């Protein structure tokens with residue numbers, strides 16, 4: 001099953017860590033927790049943004065160009081990326097934007113973190129149809145000493 005995982009600010013704006021105005025370690029534990037022991041697919045820009053493979057995960061980079069790093073698996077199409085995952089129960093898509101767009105139509109679940117924050121940004125999570133997805137989990141949290149802003153984890157499943 002393919003799942004997408006992302007953190008959204010006001011308006012579906014998503015962005016790179018450094019581009020993030022917020023500081024939410026709880027959001028990171030959540031991402032860690034939901035992606036550990038699974039393959040994660042991401043695009044070039046996001047790869048470079050992270051700069052090191054993520055541990056305890058098979059890291060697949062969807063890129064149109066040859067790869068310049070032997071620590072990860074490089075693929076060139078969506079179908080290749082999915083075949084590179086092998087037979088597993090859940091594949092995790094970690095963005096970026098384009099990547100999110102291409103996999104949504106095949107995804108069966110979405111793990112989203114809604115952050116109580118307005119930020120001007122270049123990109124957005126694809127617009128998905130609410131009638132087609134069921135919110136089966138949700139949990140809001142106020143900000144705090146570690147967490148800079150309020151946020152809400154939600155998990156939806158395609159109906």
Ligand SMILES: Nc1nc(=O)c2c([nH]1)NC[C@H](CCc1ccc(C(=O)N[C@@H](CCC(=O)O)C(=O)O)cc1)C2
Nearest residue numbers: 005006007017027028029031032054055094095113
């Ligand atoms: N929930 C969620 N939050 C986010 O900020 C993002 C998504 N999803 N998905 C897409 C994207 C990926 C960004 C991103 C950047 C760095 C690390 C990282 O260091 N992960 C470590 C966490 C370190 C720790 O937990 O102490 C990991 O091993 O997962 C993870 C994700 C950003």
